[PDB]
Amino acid sequence: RKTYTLTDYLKNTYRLKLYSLRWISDHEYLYKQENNILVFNAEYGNSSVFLENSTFDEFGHSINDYSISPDGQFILLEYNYVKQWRHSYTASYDIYDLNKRQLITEERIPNNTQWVTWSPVGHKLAYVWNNDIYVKIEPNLPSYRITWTGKEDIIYNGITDWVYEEEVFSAYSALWWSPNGTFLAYAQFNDTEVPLIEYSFYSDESLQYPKTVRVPYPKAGAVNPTVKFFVVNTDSLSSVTNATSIQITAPASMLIGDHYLCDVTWATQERISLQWLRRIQNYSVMDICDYDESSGRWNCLVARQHIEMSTTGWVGRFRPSEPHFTLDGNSFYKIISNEEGYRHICYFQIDKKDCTFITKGTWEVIGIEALTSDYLYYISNEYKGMPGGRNLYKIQLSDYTKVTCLSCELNPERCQYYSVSFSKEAKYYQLRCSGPGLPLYTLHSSVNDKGLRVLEDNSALDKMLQNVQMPSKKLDFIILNETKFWYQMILPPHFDKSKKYPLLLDVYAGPCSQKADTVFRLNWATYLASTENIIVASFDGRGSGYQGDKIMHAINRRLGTFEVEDQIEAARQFSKMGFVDNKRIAIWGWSYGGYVTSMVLGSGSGVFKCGIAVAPVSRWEYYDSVYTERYMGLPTPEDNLDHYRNSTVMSRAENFKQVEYLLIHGTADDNVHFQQSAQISKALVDVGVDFQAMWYTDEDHGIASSTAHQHIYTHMSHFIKQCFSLP
Amino acid sequence: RKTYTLTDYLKNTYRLKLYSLRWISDHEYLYKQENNILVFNAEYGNSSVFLENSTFDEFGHSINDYSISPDGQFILLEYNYVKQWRHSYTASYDIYDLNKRQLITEERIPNNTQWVTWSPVGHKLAYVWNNDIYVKIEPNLPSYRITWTGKEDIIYNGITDWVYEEEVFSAYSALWWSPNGTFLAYAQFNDTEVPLIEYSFYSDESLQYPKTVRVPYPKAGAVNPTVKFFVVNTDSLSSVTNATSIQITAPASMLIGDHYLCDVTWATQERISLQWLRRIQNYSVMDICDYDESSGRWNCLVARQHIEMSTTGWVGRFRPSEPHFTLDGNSFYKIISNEEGYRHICYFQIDKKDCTFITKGTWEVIGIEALTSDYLYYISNEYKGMPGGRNLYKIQLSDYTKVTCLSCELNPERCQYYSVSFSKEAKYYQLRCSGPGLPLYTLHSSVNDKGLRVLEDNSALDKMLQNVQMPSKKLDFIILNETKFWYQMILPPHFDKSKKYPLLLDVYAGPCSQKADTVFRLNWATYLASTENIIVASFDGRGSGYQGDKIMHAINRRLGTFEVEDQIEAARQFSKMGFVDNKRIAIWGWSYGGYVTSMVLGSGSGVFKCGIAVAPVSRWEYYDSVYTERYMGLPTPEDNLDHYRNSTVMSRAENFKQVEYLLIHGTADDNVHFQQSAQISKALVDVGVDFQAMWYTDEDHGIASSTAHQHIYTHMSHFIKQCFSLP
Amino acid sequence: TECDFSPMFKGVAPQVYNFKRLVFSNCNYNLTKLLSLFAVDEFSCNGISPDAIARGCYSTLTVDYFAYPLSMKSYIRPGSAGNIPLYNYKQSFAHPTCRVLASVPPNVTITKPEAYGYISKCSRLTGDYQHIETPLYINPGEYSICRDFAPLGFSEDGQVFKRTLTQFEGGGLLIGVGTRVPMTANLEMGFVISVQYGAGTDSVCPMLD
Ligand SMILES: *[C@@H]1O[C@H](CO)[C@@H](O[C@@H]2O[C@H](CO)[C@@H](O[C@@H]3O[C@H](CO)[C@@H](O)[C@H](O)[C@@H]3O)[C@H](O)[C@H]2NC(C)=O)[C@H](O)[C@H]1NC(C)=O
Ligand SMILES: *[C@@H]1O[C@H](CO)[C@@H](O[C@@H]2O[C@H](CO)[C@@H](O)[C@H](O)[C@H]2NC(C)=O)[C@H](O)[C@H]1NC(C)=O
Ligand SMILES: *[C@@H]1O[C@H](CO)[C@@H](O[C@@H]2O[C@H](CO)[C@@H](O)[C@H](O)[C@H]2NC(C)=O)[C@H](O)[C@H]1NC(C)=O
Ligand SMILES: *[C@@H]1O[C@H](CO)[C@@H](O[C@@H]2O[C@H](CO)[C@@H](O)[C@H](O)[C@H]2NC(C)=O)[C@H](O)[C@H]1NC(C)=O
Ligand SMILES: *[C@@H]1O[C@H](CO)[C@@H](O[C@@H]2O[C@H](CO)[C@@H](O)[C@H](O)[C@H]2NC(C)=O)[C@H](O)[C@H]1NC(C)=O
Ligand SMILES: *[C@@H]1O[C@H](CO)[C@@H](O[C@@H]2O[C@H](CO)[C@@H](O)[C@H](O)[C@H]2NC(C)=O)[C@H](O)[C@H]1NC(C)=O
Ligand SMILES: *[C@@H]1O[C@H](CO)[C@@H](O[C@@H]2O[C@H](CO)[C@@H](O)[C@H](O)[C@H]2NC(C)=O)[C@H](O)[C@H]1NC(C)=O
Ligand SMILES: *[C@@H]1O[C@H](CO)[C@@H](O[C@@H]2O[C@H](CO)[C@@H](O)[C@H](O)[C@H]2NC(C)=O)[C@H](O)[C@H]1NC(C)=O
Ligand SMILES: *[C@@H]1O[C@H](CO)[C@@H](O[C@@H]2O[C@H](CO)[C@@H](O)[C@H](O)[C@H]2NC(C)=O)[C@H](O)[C@H]1NC(C)=O
Ligand SMILES: *[C@@H]1O[C@H](CO)[C@@H](O[C@@H]2O[C@H](CO)[C@@H](O)[C@H](O)[C@H]2NC(C)=O)[C@H](O)[C@H]1NC(C)=O
Ligand SMILES: *[C@@H]1O[C@H](CO)[C@@H](O[C@@H]2O[C@H](CO)[C@@H](O)[C@H](O)[C@H]2NC(C)=O)[C@H](O)[C@H]1NC(C)=O
Ligand SMILES: *[C@@H]1O[C@H](CO)[C@@H](O[C@@H]2O[C@H](CO)[C@@H](O)[C@H](O)[C@H]2NC(C)=O)[C@H](O)[C@H]1NC(C)=O
Ligand SMILES: *[C@@H]1O[C@H](CO)[C@@H](O)[C@H](O)[C@H]1NC(C)=O
């Protein structure tokens, strides 16, 4: 039959169909069928029309995105959306009064706000404009100003700077409503002393003089931004009185030196929890503070602090886990590594330092999704001992002995990677299977775990794919020393066990990452396997996780040493199956994958014929402070400067002489600056090694613009074709 | 035998030996041998030791260059040379008392001086430091400050800004001593409203943050720098007296709008001639002023002014010609266009407007080299009617019908390209032959044109090259309509006139320029012809010189229309001979040649398979003001904006579907900014056309770094080999 | 002789943590002046009454005065567990006390400092990984060990000062945090008055014939 061509990827002929719902109650959810918003009752499946299909909601501007108030009375509509960072963007907002007929035209939200959020209940609004926080109690009332210190690129009130957005919070928003909606907590970031990275932006062709973009960006060993934390009582706002912000001071053990705020979670209506982290990622602290009605301040008693310390490595996977509090708020559950180096769920009382583990075994609990008074639901990879699987289990609050799986037998062949979205109060939950078979979205009732109905099965996609030569996926393990390590291979269809197939290695190999799992993807590797008949392999090495801390922390303070050797070893063991051609082997990777690809090519093994690095990291002093210092500490002569200088790509530049290298980097990359690729090019030039290069002007780290996406992928495909001599 | 390989080029195995001398008197010159400096008598040839191998002269710093005082009493040593622009650079200077043994220790030239200059007589010193002019009457006395308005990037005293240096003066110096040295004239440039171009510099690997280089650079249609002109009596400065600078005002016809000054020529002491040229380059004014010592003012009547205007196009080749004043200073000869558009010598009295021509013919006078009391010596291309040949002639001042060629008959076969350097008072002159044979340096006496001795013959180089397969060079012309245009071909050794050779078109095709000549060169084309058996062709069409204003100005206000069409037509005409393969024609060029290559590739002719552009020009609105506005006028809607918009490369981007394009650009290019190639790449991506690119970090327009030069040429060689399927 | 109130009227008003103390023995005070130099907002007395300091003779008076915003009137209140008693000023309930929050009139010559301030956290952090917090709480009538980090006041609200403690001090990095409260139109002050009996053979009296 016909195969999956490159154009099929590029033109998205095979569209993955999703079923995204938003619970607005304990038994009803919204869904944008067509572009109108239907409301669905879970128990019967009957549907009605919440918002009618028409240009009436905005009229005159293309509608980008919308948000429904919790009470369903108002709709917030945004247009003129302009993305700036990964999560940073600006747009204009209007409020449509869904209650009777019309838009609200008085006291409209400004034409350049950076972020807008509803209260959890009611219809309050909080937005950020010119780095200042403004609050509207009612959509048709004038706004109340909360902050006055906002200043472009210097002070951020309620909004994150670049580094916190990208590496710490992984989200743009920096304000959190109270459960009842009375308190609004926010963070303020000061970047006065942060050095600015400057790069050229060319913009539209008609621009005569290129402009210089300056971004506050703390590199490894630079002055880090400072962070402060405040809360405001929204119920006390008055027209002729300045807003009052009560400050919450960081714990004493934390603010000795540079420190970061990890995340903030509301416990009860007047109880809050904050996670702080030392700059040297160890000794994380959870603080719990209660509102004092007599004293507007927040008293954080010493006995309610909880400490997290690591020895073999750093704290947490990427960030200390957020606690899930009980209804009363006097106890909670947290994911924490055990004495055997495995992550499990510990039950904490707010006044006790000792945690009682409720799960145990040679596996890791991935996440707590929902908490009731009698059952706790979680995602874990215990099933079949497969690190690349995810399943839903529930445990009784009373007796921890009883553990029941809710997804193990639902569809074993088509599902090993489950995710779940619970309704309010957890009467119902939607299950999403993203495992080996086509993704499947279903709805179930928690009361008696009965399957209710199939929401989305992608049946049309299955019928279309029945005429297409799809590849196969194999997941297995190889034993190195006294430990097994997992790997996956995308095999071309009609895979012959006797023929010699070429092997292309997709490598991210980043710490805590995982490239070998059961997730179904249709991407570039799929086209390679289907049309070009290339076996695409990925391997989990010694910083890869969901597997333990014995494996996870093996690369602590020695980045780029054990992972590279592990990739080399994986290739070597892959060599002796009859399906791998030793002469033609290549390693490609993106970002950190590019760094690993470059270091592997500079290893001198001679196994790999060629390699592609897309925006590779070249010298860890060039990267941002938080990410690098998580694994490497500070680059000072007394602490770790020796390993910083030794682990550069440039120092291995001469080893590139035997291999063919392809380097790609966008000029407007705000994440991995062009400087890294420029330095690699300089080293290769003055060592006299030939190579290929490709720059994409005005493109960011993701190279997500449509045309740039097409061009980069066809260029990489052409390069792979010539290197493997596929034509 | 051995062939001329890439290594032979890039390691410079075959080095050209030259003979550089500097006249200091009527009959003696210095010559730098190995480490010592010798003084040579012209009439007898006997030599003496001027300076010995004083390796201990700085005992710790290497002497880069040296400067001889006119009287020979002092020697100037320069070191710590740091190139800044094409001609601009900074260095440290020391003054050595040559008379017995000693260096000067008290009052020495500063570390960061931008320019240093001897007086024509005596041993006066004039230098520029921190954009300020200082004068030393003696080496061992403190300097007298002459200027006080010096301020970097704003006000330039005594030295040129970027655009004046690059396009107008072709030098950093902007100060001129009187012939007796009694007066010092200089210019002051104001660049307050000149826009700044910013580009990123990455520097050495250890630098964590890239720096931003900012240059005052007037793009097409921007505010040009203003110029003021001053004269100072060098004999009058005292320690207790501020410097007095008499300003010279521009002529009344010039003040109406923006204007340029072309050059300055001392017409005897007391009398000076200055050439101004309006922003629109179609009119120019030479003003002569006499100093009135009895008043101290410059009372220089309008009646002694002269004007030059053009109708077809601009004035001059790049600027109005240099005036050569008689001994008395009452008459002078200039190179100006005649009635039919050829440049010849016209004789001018300071008191009348009409000029009398003394030379005529269908040829061009390239330069006037010397004026005696009875004969005028000039270099012209009249011999053999070849615009690519240069010969020296003399004519009687009384009866100018007597013409004597000084180089026609001395060596017709080996030499057709001569340059000459006369001694003081022009008693002896050195002739330098640059092609088509090996360079030949000879010395002759003016009295009876008797050859004295051969200074350099390069005989050993010829004998050692005799066993190496050198390419051949053919020079000829073709006719299009009633007009002839010249071309040259580098042909592979043992060139077969019948068998099929591939063709590479080397193009610059810039206005007024000439690439078809008789000069012998060892360059990339030599290696390509020697090893890859590739014919390298060059062609001089409109509007190249030096063949009269008919061809010169035919391309006025029409850049990229007649030149590109003529290049395409030339390629088509090249195809029709039996020894060139039409399916295997490539094209490449540099700078303006890059613009030509981009335009021809975007034409859709289909005769070119693939092509390389290094630092190509893409849009004239991006380039500097002077160069473009000379040929295009101002980019304003009423004047020529439509033609500015109709001649951008990006508009032709889609037409690159059929051709393979390699784009190379240095990111630190200050002349052709990286913006230009970045926009080229952005357009090519936005039309989704595949191409190759490769950037060179921190390299300038010339890419003169040894390793960078090696890398760029080997990369281009690999690319052309691949495109042509040679290996 | 008359009681010397002059030190209270010279220089900037002291902060709550850097309060100042005046001990009166063998002197007479003019009540006419004290009635006019201040406008009392609150007179709060424990085991004592104002209508008895103003008409009786005592062996000793002790006045602790500081600058205190009226807005935080009850934070200083006795039996509160707020920052103020923990790190700034704890007045013994057993000591007879008449805590007075008042306001200085415009023409009275008491220099207004910059914005008010109080010590948010004063802690003796110690431990191998610096894990132990071990907060330090001032005993009644005792200045905070965090008094000297910035005696004048706090430059910006939420300020941190870290000073290593030697073994005599107890070891570990002493840590302090300070909070800043905007200054009002009129300087507002707090006073703690204590009367001591049988502490000598001379008395403090109101000026009377
Ligand atoms: C010759 O003329 C120049 C004209 O620039 C004189 O230079 C300028 O002289 C004035 C008056 O002395 C200087 O102003 C002074 O500036 C200093 C700054 O610290 C200030 O403290 C003084 O009160 C006064 O305002 C001015 O700066 C100076 N400009 C430069 C570029 O030096 C020069 O003094 C005259 N005489 C000589 C010594 O030939
Ligand atoms: C689906 O049908 C059920 C009834 O079978 C609807 O439930 C009603 O909801 C309204 C909400 O205002 C209540 O007033 C009624 O009492 C409910 N039951 C009855 C008797 O009708 C449910 O709302 C329907 N859902 C949708 C979205 O259509
Ligand atoms: C947001 O911007 C729009 C323009 O994009 C503003 O609407 C304009 O308002 C002015 C004054 O009434 C009119 O003259 C224009 O014709 C309007 N333009 C459009 C396209 O509607 C709008 O007022 C701005 N709103 C805010 C919140 O500032
Ligand atoms: C939401 O919850 C908060 C916290 O419980 C409520 O605020 C308190 O309400 C109680 C009862 O009215 C008062 O006794 C407390 O003094 C309030 N504390 C403060 C000042 O936060 C709030 O009223 C609840 N209601 C809302 C707004 O949803
Ligand atoms: C952001 O940081 C700057 C620098 O820390 C703060 O400005 C300084 O504040 C200190 C007091 O802590 C003064 O001594 C300095 O004179 C101030 N100037 C600078 C630039 O150093 C600024 O207050 C901070 N802003 C916020 C809102 O936190
Ligand atoms: C709330 O406080 C802010 C502090 O910035 C006040 O804004 C300033 O007010 C003063 C006058 O008191 C002006 O001179 C400044 O120009 C204002 N600055 C800004 C950033 O606007 C604001 O007026 C206060 N609002 C009140 C009194 O409710
Ligand atoms: C947590 O990180 C700290 C640094 O903030 C570690 O401190 C080390 O302390 C010992 C004391 O003997 C020193 O020898 C080390 O040099 C310190 N290391 C660094 C990175 O400075 C502390 O041990 C860490 N805790 C762990 C890993 O359990
Ligand atoms: C070359 O030789 C001539 C002599 O043949 C030199 O000229 C003489 O120079 C000396 C001084 O050194 C005078 O005293 C003589 O009167 C000169 N004689 C003549 C004939 O001019 C000349 O200097 C020598 N030149 C060099 C550079 O060696
Ligand atoms: C300057 O140095 C050069 C060497 O670089 C000397 O030249 C050599 O001189 C000796 C003795 O005459 C000859 O045997 C050599 O053949 C010369 N060249 C070489 C290859 O070394 C020169 O003599 C020195 N001159 C002075 C003035 O000291
Ligand atoms: C140019 O710079 C050099 C330094 O690079 C100066 O030389 C120094 O002079 C000082 C003072 O006499 C000495 O202490 C240093 O040891 C010298 N260093 C070197 C490398 O020689 C020099 O004086 C400067 N010259 C001028 C003209 O300013
Ligand atoms: C260069 O030109 C600028 C004009 O931009 C001159 O600056 C002006 O100076 C005069 C006299 O001081 C002022 O009245 C103008 O307001 C200034 N204009 C601006 C916008 O700066 C500058 O002085 C000139 N420099 C020289 C010495 O030629
Ligand atoms: C020099 O150039 C200018 C600008 O091109 C000429 O001025 C224009 O000439 C054209 C043709 O004669 C007229 O149509 C315009 O009205 C003129 N004015 C403008 C727009 O500048 C000028 O005539 C030229 N002079 C010479 C000596 O040829
Ligand atoms: C909304 O659009 C759908 C088609 O996408 C159409 O069937 C429906 O009738 C529309 N509703 C309206 C116009 O009310």
C29 and C87 both lie in a single domain: yes
Backbone angles phi, psi at A125, to 5 degrees: -130, 140
Tell me which residue range forms the domain holding C125: 116-181
Backbone angles phi, psi at A168, to 5 degrees: -100, -65
| B513 is annotated as an active-site residue | no
Please indicate, yes or no, if residue B297 is contained in any of the structural domains.
yes
B584 and B712 both lie in a single domain: yes
Contact C82 A295 (CB under 8 A): yes
Interface of B with A (CB under 8 A): 195, 197-200, 202, 205, 208-210, 212, 219, 222, 619, 621-622, 648, 650, 667, 673-675, 678-679, 681-683, 685-686, 688, 690, 692-698, 707-708, 710-711, 714-715, 718
> What is the identity of the amino acid at A228?
K
Contact A678 B621 (CB under 8 A): no
In this complex, the residue of A252, A292, A299 whose CB is nearest that of residue C133 is A252
Please indicate, yes or no, if residue B220 is contained in any of the structural domains.
no
Whole-angstrom distance, CA of residue A652 vs CA of residue A661: 13
Q: Last residue of a domain, which of B350, B378, B412? A: B350
Q: Are A369 and A380 in contact (CB under 8 A)?
A: no
C95 and C125 both lie in a single domain: no
Mark out the alpha helices in B141-195 (DSSP H runs). Answer: 162-163
- The structure tokens listed for A90 are 């600006």
| A94 is annotated as an active-site residue | no
C12 and C104 both lie in a single domain: yes
Contact C74 A294 (CB under 8 A): yes
Q: Last residue of a domain, which of B318, B350, B382? A: B350
Distance from CA of B723 to the nearest CA of A (A): 13
Please indicate, yes or no, if residue C1 is contained in any of the structural domains.
no
Whole-angstrom distance, CA of residue C97 vs CA of residue C100: 9
Cβ of B112 closer than 6 Å to ligand 10, yes or no, is no
CA-closest residue to ligand 7 atom 18: A639
C197 and C145 both lie in a single domain: no
Whole-angstrom distance, CA of residue B39 vs CA of residue B32: 9
Please indicate, yes or no, if residue B141 is contained in any of the structural domains.
no
Whole-angstrom distance, CA of residue B515 vs CA of residue C88: 87
The set of chains that have 3 or more CB pairs under 8 A with C is: A
* Best to test chain B binding among A665, A695, A703, A715 (most B CBs inside 10 Å): A695
C103 and C19 both lie in a single domain: yes
Whole-angstrom distance, CA of residue A171 vs CA of residue C77: 43
Ligand index nearest the alpha carbon of residue A281: 7
- The structure tokens listed for A103 are 């838009």
Bridge partners (DSSP) listed for residue A134: A127, A145
A448 and A482 both lie in a single domain: no
Cβ of B52 closer than 6 Å to ligand 9, yes or no, is yes
- The structure tokens listed for B31 are 């010559």
Please provide the DSSP assignment of B104-126 as one string.
P-SS---TTEEEEEE-SSTT-EE
Please indicate, yes or no, if residue A124 is contained in any of the structural domains.
no
Query: How many domains would you assign to chain B?
Result: 2
Q: Beta strand A450-456 with C159-164: parallel, antiparallel or unpaired?
A: unpaired
Whole-angstrom distance, CA of residue B252 vs CA of residue B230: 17
Contact C80 A294 (CB under 8 A): yes
Ligand index nearest the alpha carbon of residue A49: 2
Nearest to B4 by CA among B404, B445, B467, B344: B467
- The structure tokens listed for A639 are 């602490």
Whole-angstrom distance, CA of residue C18 vs CA of residue C13: 10
Residue A479 half-sphere exposure toward CB, CA atoms < 13 A: 2
Mark out the alpha helices in A651-698 (DSSP H runs). Answer: 674-686
Using only C-alpha atoms, chain C has a radius of gyration, in whole angstroms, of 19
C95 and C194 both lie in a single domain: yes
Nearest to C142 by CA among C64, C46, C43: C64
Q: Are A643 and A557 in contact (CB under 8 A)?
A: yes
Mark out the alpha helices in B577-698 (DSSP H runs). Answer: 592-601, 625-632, 641-645, 674-686
B470 and B345 both lie in a single domain: no
Atom nearest to A110 CA in ligand 3: 27
Contacting residues of A for B710, CB less than 8 Å apart? 688
Please indicate, yes or no, if residue B469 is contained in any of the structural domains.
yes
C80 and C166 both lie in a single domain: no
Classify residue B322 by its DSSP letter.
P
C100 and C163 both lie in a single domain: no
Please indicate, yes or no, if residue B649 is contained in any of the structural domains.
yes
Please indicate, yes or no, if residue B127 is contained in any of the structural domains.
no
Q: Are B646 and B602 in contact (CB under 8 A)?
A: no
Omega before residue B546 within 30° of 0, cis: yes
| B669 is annotated as an active-site residue | yes
Nearest to B51 by CA among B40, B31, B37: B37
Omega before residue B543 within 30° of 0, cis: yes
CATH number for C40: 3.30.70.1840
Contact B694 A692 (CB under 8 A): yes
Q: Are A414 and A433 in contact (CB under 8 A)?
A: yes
- Mapped onto helix, strand or coil, the DSSP state of residue A572 is helix
Q: Please give the method by which this entry was determined.
A: cryo-EM
Q: Are B393 and B405 in contact (CB under 8 A)?
A: yes
Whole-angstrom distance, CA of residue A201 vs CA of residue A213: 6
Mutual angle of helices A674-686 and B706-723, in 10-degree steps: 90
**CA triple B73-B87-B262, angle to 5 deg:** 95
Whole-angstrom distance, CA of residue A407 vs CA of residue A392: 6
Atom nearest to A283 CA in ligand 7: 1
User: What's the per-residue H, E or C state across A288-345?
Assistant: EEEECCCCCCEECCHHHCEEECCCCCCCCCCCCCCCEECCCCCEEEEEEECCCCCEEE
Q: Are B208 and A218 in contact (CB under 8 A)?
A: no
C86 and C168 both lie in a single domain: no
- Mapped onto helix, strand or coil, the DSSP state of residue B336 is strand
Instruction: Count Cβ atoms below 10 Å from residue B467 Cβ, excluding itself.
Output: 8
Contacting residues of A for C164, CB less than 8 Å apart? none
Distances (CA, A) of A376 to A72, A372, A405, B200, B233: 30, 6, 12, 55, 97
Q: What's the gap in Å between B34 CA and the centre of ligand 9?
A: 9
- Mapped onto helix, strand or coil, the DSSP state of residue B574 is helix
- The structure tokens listed for A235 are 């119920």
Q: What's the gap in Å between A147 CA and the centre of ligand 3?
A: 26
Atom nearest to B109 CA in ligand 10: 27
> What is the identity of the amino acid at B408?
C
**Which segments within B340-436 are labelled E, that is strand?**
343-349, 356-357, 365-371, 375-380, 391-396, 403-405, 415-422, 428-436
Please indicate, yes or no, if residue A685 is contained in any of the structural domains.
yes
Tell me which residue range forms the domain holding B667: 462-723
Q: Last residue of a domain, which of A362, A390, A419? A: A362
Nearest to C12 by CA among C91, C67, C58, C62: C67
Atom nearest to B49 CA in ligand 9: 27
A604 and A687 both lie in a single domain: yes
Query: What is the best residue among B32, B49, B53 to mutate for testing ligand 9's pocket, by most ligand atoms within 8 Å of CB?
Result: B53
Cβ of B206 closer than 6 Å to ligand 8, yes or no, is no
In this complex, the residue of A256, A283, A307 whose CB is nearest that of residue C175 is A256
Pairs of residues, one from chain A and one from chain B, whose beta carbons lie less than 8 Å apart: 113
Distance of CA A647 to the CA centre of its chain: 27
Backbone angles phi, psi at B719, to 5 degrees: -65, -45
Cβ < 6 A, ligand 6 pocket: A 148, 242
- The structure tokens listed for B257 are 């709008």
Whole-angstrom distance, CA of residue B651 vs CA of residue B602: 9
Helix, strand, coil abundance in chain C, percent, nearest 5? 10, 35, 55
- Report chain breaks in chain B, C–N > 2.5 Å, as residues after which they occur: none
C77 and C93 both lie in a single domain: yes
Omega before residue B436 within 30° of 0, cis: yes
Whole-angstrom distance, CA of residue C93 vs CA of residue C95: 5
A605 and A469 both lie in a single domain: yes
Query: What is the best residue among A182, A231, A232, A236 to mutate for testing ligand 4's pocket, by most ligand atoms within 8 Å of CB?
Result: A182
Element (H, E) at B488: strand B483-491
In this complex, the residue of A198, A686, A718 whose CB is nearest that of residue B212 is A198
The set of chains that have 3 or more CB pairs under 8 A with B is: A
Whole-angstrom distance, CA of residue B519 vs CA of residue B415: 9
Resolution in A: 2.4
- Mapped onto helix, strand or coil, the DSSP state of residue B99 is coil
> What is the identity of the amino acid at B144?
Y
Q: What's the gap in Å between A711 CA and the centre of ligand 3?
A: 38
Q: Are A231 and A274 in contact (CB under 8 A)?
A: no
C109 and C121 both lie in a single domain: no
A450 and A469 both lie in a single domain: no
Ramachandran assignment for B442, one of left (phi > 0), alpha (psi -120 to 50 degrees), beta (any other) = beta
Instruction: Tell whether A295 is within 8 A of chain C (Cβ).
Output: yes
Whole-angstrom distance, CA of residue B393 vs CA of residue B406: 6
- Cβ contacts of B264 within 8 Å, gap of 6 or more: B176, B185, B272, B273, B274, B275
Query: How many domains would you assign to chain C?
Result: 2
A664 and A677 both lie in a single domain: yes
Contacting residues of B for A673, CB less than 8 Å apart? 210
Whole-angstrom distance, CA of residue A112 vs CA of residue B626: 42
CATH number for C171: 2.20.210.30
- The structure tokens listed for C178 are 């300070």
Cβ of A53 closer than 6 Å to ligand 13, yes or no, is yes
Long-range contacts of B86-93 (CB under 8 A, 24+ apart): B86/B165, B86/B166, B86/B671, B86/B701, B86/B702, B87/B165, B87/B170, B87/B171, B87/B172, B88/B114, B88/B159, B88/B160, B88/B165, B88/B172, B89/B114, B89/B172, B90/B114, B91/B64, B93/B127
A715 and A668 both lie in a single domain: yes
CA-closest residue to ligand 4 atom 15: A293
CATH number for B569: 3.40.50.1820
B468 and B346 both lie in a single domain: no
C108 and C36 both lie in a single domain: yes
Whole-angstrom distance, CA of residue B571 vs CA of residue B116: 49
Atom nearest to B282 CA in ligand 12: 1
Contact A252 C175 (CB under 8 A): yes
Q: What's the gap in Å between B22 CA and the centre of ligand 8?
A: 20
Q: Are C165 and C172 in contact (CB under 8 A)?
A: yes
The active-site residue out of B173, B591, B677, B717 is B591
In this complex, the residue of C75, C82, C133 whose CB is nearest that of residue A302 is C133
Q: Beta strand A306-308 with A284-291: parallel, antiparallel or unpaired?
A: antiparallel
The active-site residue out of A119, A143, A591, A647 is A591
